[PDB]
C-alpha cells in the first residue's frame, strides 16, 4: 500500500569490489507523526539480486525505538564460498529501544542478529561493519528511584567465527541496589545479584550464581584534605552443573556447589595545594594515597562467566577490582599513590592537566587460577604505573594523552596520544597515535598472541582532515597507517558541494576487511569502494571503520 507520505527519496549509487555496481532507491512512508517507515530496494551486481533494506521508527509512551530488517533472498558469491547448503539467503535484524516511563521504569533493548558470521564483512550499515567481532543481544527492564533500584536483563552474543563461537549468556540476570546516606556518619550501600549463565556449547558448564555485597563507607573531609574509609563484604555462591566433560578436557577442579566470602578494606586520602602564578593564572597540585586489602581465596573450583582483565587508567589505579564481573576477585595488599597537577587562567577555566600514578604490591595478587603468562615473575613492588594529560592552548587547538606501563611486561602496556585543531564543523585537522605492546596482547588475550594477525600488537598513527578548498566546495579525508607492518589500514577521500539547496557528495574509501590465509605467512585483504549520494551535514567523518571523534 503505502500512502499519505512524503514520496520517493533521491537514489544513491556505489561501486565496491565485493558487490560491484550498487543502486539504492529509497522510498519513505510517513505513516503518522510519531512513527514512520522506509523501504529501500538496494540492487547489487555480482550478488545477483536486490537486497530489501527495511527501516521502521516509532515514538511511544513506553519509549522511542527503531527496527531494521535487511534481506537478500540469494547470494551468488556466498554460494560459491559456501556450497554445502542450497539455501543462500542472507539477512540482518536489528531492534533498538529506550524509554523511561514515569521517571522510574526503564525499558531498554539492543538486539542484533545476522544470518551468518560473514554478513557485516560484506554488507556495511549503521548497525554493523567489518570491524565487529560479535553481535550484541541485550534486553533490560528495571525500576529505579533515588534510594533503590532493581533491574532484570538478558544478555546474549553472536560471535562471528565459524571455528570458535563459544560465548556465555546471562539468562536472566537480576541486579538490586539499596542506598542510605546518613547512617550516623556512615554512607551504606547494599548490592545483590542473581545470575544464570548458560553457553551455546553444551559441553561448557552452566551455573547459577548468587551474590550479596554490603558496603559501609565513612567519608570525612575538611578544607584541605579528604579521608574516606570503606569496609565491604563479598559473599558469593555458585550452583554449577554439567562439569564432568569439561573437567575431563581441561585440568580443572570445578565442583557443583562452591561458596566464597571475602572481606575488603580500603582507605583513600586526598589533599590539595593551590599555587598562584603569573598574569592571574592559578595552578593546583593534588596528591592521593590509597591502601587496599583483600584476603586470598582459592577460586579454582569456580568457572569463568563474566570476568576479564581490566585496563588501568590513572583513576583505574585506585579501582578495587582487577577483573570484571564476580568470578575472579584477586587478592589485594596494595598501596596506590598518585599525584595530579592542574592549571587555570584568570577566568578559572581548566586549561592544562597532568596525572601520574603508581601502585605498590606488598604480596602477590592471587585468585587460585592465575595462569596469566607474564614475561617475568615480578610479584611485588611498584609494578603498575599510569599517566594522563590534557592541554588546551586556546579555543581552537587541543591535546590529550595517556600511557600505562607495567614492569611484568618490561614494556609500556597501553599508550595513546591525540592532538587536534578544531575551528568548527567544516574546518579541522586531527593527528592521533595508539599503541599496544605485544606483551600486553600476550598477557590479556591468550589465543590472539599466537596468530600473526594480532601477535605484534598495535602501533597505529592516524590523520583526519576536513577542509574546504574553494569557498563553496568542501573536501574531507582520512588516513590511518600501521607502523609495524609499514602498511595502511584505512584511507578515505571525499568531496561535497552544496549547489543551491541539496548538496552532491562523492566519496571513496579503502579498508582492511579480512585476513588472507594460504600465502608466505599471511596477508590482509583490502576493500575499495566509491560512492555517490545526492541537510547540510558531514557524515563523511563518521563513515570510516575508524570514525572521527572530536578531542577538543
Amino acid at each position: 500500500g503505502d500512502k499519505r507520505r512524503s514520496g520517493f527519496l533521491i537514489p544513491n549509487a556505489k561501486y565496491s569490489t565485493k558487490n560491484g555496481v550498487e543502486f539504492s532507491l529509497p522510498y519513505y512512508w510517513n505513516i503518522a507523526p510519531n512513527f514512520d517507515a522506509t523501504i529501500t530496494p538496494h540492487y547489487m551486481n555480482k550478488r545477483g539480486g536486490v537486497m530489501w533494506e527495511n527501516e521502521f521508527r516509532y515514538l511511544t509512551q513506553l519509549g522511542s525505538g527503531l527496527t531494521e530488517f535487511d534481506y537478500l533472498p540469494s547470494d551468488k558469491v556466498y554460494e560459491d564460498d559456501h556450497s554445502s547448503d542450497s539455501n543462500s539467503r542472507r539477512w540482518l535484524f536489528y531492534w533498538n529501544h529506550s524509554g523511561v516511563i514515569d521517571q522510574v521504569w526503564r525499558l531498554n533493548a539492543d538486539y542484533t542478529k545476522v544470518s551468518d558470521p560473514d554478513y557485516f564483512n560484506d554488507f556495511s550499515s549503521k548497525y554493523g561493519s567489518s570491524t565487529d567481532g560479535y553481535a550484541t543481544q541485550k534486553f533490560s527492564a528495571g525500576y529505579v528511584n533515588q534510594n533503590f533500584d532493581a533491574t532484570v536483563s538478558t544478555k546474549q552474543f553472536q560471535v562471528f567465527d565459524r571455528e570458535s563461537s563459544n560465548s556465555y549468556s546471562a539468562e536472566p540476570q537480576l541486579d538490586v541496589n539499596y542506598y542510605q546516606n546518613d547512617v550516623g556518619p556512615f554512607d551504606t550501600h547494599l548490592y545483590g545479584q542473581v545470575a544464570h549463565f548458560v553457553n551455546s556449547n553444551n559441553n561448557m558448564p552452566e551455573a547459577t550464581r548468587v551474590h550479596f555485597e554490603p558496603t559501609i563507607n565513612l567519608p570525612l573531609s575538611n578544607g584541605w584534605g579528604s579521608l574516606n574509609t570503606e569496609a565491604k563484604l563479598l559473599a558469593t555462591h555458585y550452583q554449577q552443573s554439567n562439569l564432568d566433560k569439561y573437567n575431563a578436557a581441561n585440568g580443572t577442579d570445578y565442583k557443583e556447589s562452591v561458596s566464597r566470602v571475602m572481606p575488603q578494606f580500603k582507605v583513600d586520602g586526598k589533599m590539595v595545594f593551590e599555587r598562584d602564578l603569573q598574569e592571574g593564572f592559578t595552578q593546583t597540585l593534588e596528591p592521593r594515597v590509597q591502601y587496599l586489602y583483600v584476603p586470598y581465596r582459592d577460586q579454582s573450583e569456580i568457572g569463568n562467566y563474566d570476568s576479564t582483565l581490566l585496563q588501568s587508567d590513572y583513576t583505574g589505579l585506585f579501582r578495587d577490582r582487577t577483573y570484571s564481573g564476580l568470578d575472579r576477585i584477586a587478592s589485594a595488599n596494595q598501596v596506590t599513590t598518585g599525584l595530579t597537577s592542574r592549571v587555570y587562567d584568570a577566568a578559572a577555566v581548566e586549561r592544562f592537566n597532568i596525572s601520574v600514578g603508581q601502585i605498590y604490591y606488598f604480596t602477590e595478587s592471587r585468585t587460585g587460577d592465575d595462569n596469566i603468562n607474564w614475561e617475568n615473575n615480578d610479584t611485588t613492588g611498584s609494578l603498575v604505573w599510569a599517566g594522563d594529560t590534557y592541554w588546551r592552548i586556546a579555543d581552537e587547538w587541543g591535546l590529550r594523552g595517556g600511557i600505562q606501563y607495567d614492569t611484568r611486561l618490561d614494556n609500556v602496556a597501553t599508550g595513546n596520544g591525540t592532538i587536534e585543531y578544531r575551528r568548527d564543523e567544516n574546518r579541522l585537522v586531527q593527528l592521533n597515535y595508539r599503541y599496544a605492546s605485544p606483551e600486553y596482547i600476550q598477557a590479556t588475550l591468550p589465543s590472539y598472541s599466537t596468530a600473526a594477525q594480532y601477535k605484534q600488537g598495535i602501533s597505529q598513527v592516524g590523520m583526519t582532515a576536513s577542509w574546504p578548498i574553494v569557498d563553496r566546495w568542501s573536501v574531507v579525508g582520512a588516513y590511518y597507517y600501521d607502523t609495524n607492518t609499514r602498511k595502511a589500514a584505512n584511507q578515505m577521500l571525499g568531496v561535497q558541494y552544496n549547489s543551491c539547496c541539496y548538496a552532491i557528495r562523492l566519496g571513496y574509501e579503502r579498508k582492511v576487511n579480512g585476513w588472507n590465509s594460504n600465502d608466505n605467512g599471511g596477508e590482509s585483504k583490502y576493500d575499495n569502494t566509491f560512492g555517490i549520494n545526492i541537510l547540510g551535514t558531514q557524515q563523511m567523518l563518521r563513515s570510516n571503520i575508524l570514525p572521527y571523534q572530536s578531542s577538543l
Binding site: T136, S324, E350, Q460
Partner: protein, 146 residues
C-alpha cells in the same frame, strides 16, 4: 608558605533534570553532596538559590584501532554531557564536558566485556560529574558588571 585551598554562593543549590533518577543525575547529586552542597527542591520560594540544570547526555562508542585482519582491537567511548547553571536574574550559563575512555575488545569473552563496558560507563558518569563541578568556579567569575 604556599596557600591551601565550591563557592559560598553555591553551598545551597537546586538540581533539576527531566531524568532525576538517571545515572548522570545520581552521580552529580552524590558528587556535589560530597563537597557539602545542600540540596533543596524547587517547591521552596527560591529566589537567591542558584540552579544546576542537566540538559542531556550521550555516549558514542566508535572503533579506536583495528587489527591486521580488520577487526576491532579497542573501542573508545566518549561521554558528552550538557548542563547549564541558572542564576536567577543574571541569565543562564551553559556548560559542556567530555569524558574519553577506551578499552580492548574480545569476542571470545563477550559477556565479560559487556560487564567491563557497564563498569567503565558508570565510572565515566562519575568522572563527568566531577568535571561539571570543577567548572562552577569559571561560571561564578562570569558574573561581571556589563
Amino acid at each position: 608558605g604556599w596557600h591551601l585551598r565550591v563557592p559560598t554562593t553555591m553551598k545551597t543549590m537546586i538540581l533539576q533534570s527531566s531524568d532525576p533518577n538517571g545515572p548522570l543525575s545520581r552521580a552529580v547529586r552524590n558528587q556535589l553532596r560530597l563537597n557539602g552542597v545542600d540540596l533543596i527542591d524547587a517547591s521552596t520560594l527560591r529566589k537567591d538559590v542558584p540552579s544546576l540544570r542537566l540538559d542531556g547526555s550521550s555516549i558514542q562508542k566508535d572503533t579506536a584501532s583495528v587489527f591486521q585482519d580488520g577487526r576491532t582491537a579497542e573501542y573508545q567511548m566518549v561521554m558528552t554531557v550538557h548542563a547549564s547553571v541558572l542564576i536567577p536574574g543574571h541569565d543562564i550559563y551553559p556548560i559542556t564536558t567530555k569524558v574519553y575512555r577506551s578499552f580492548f575488545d574480545n569476542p571470545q569473552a563477550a559477556l565479560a566485556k559487556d560487564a567491563e563496558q557497564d563498569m567503565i560507563i558508570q565510572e565515566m558518569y562519575d568522572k563527568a560529574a566531577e568535571q561539571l563541578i570543577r567548572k562552577l568556579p569559571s561560571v561564578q567569575v562570569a558574573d561581571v558588571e556589563a
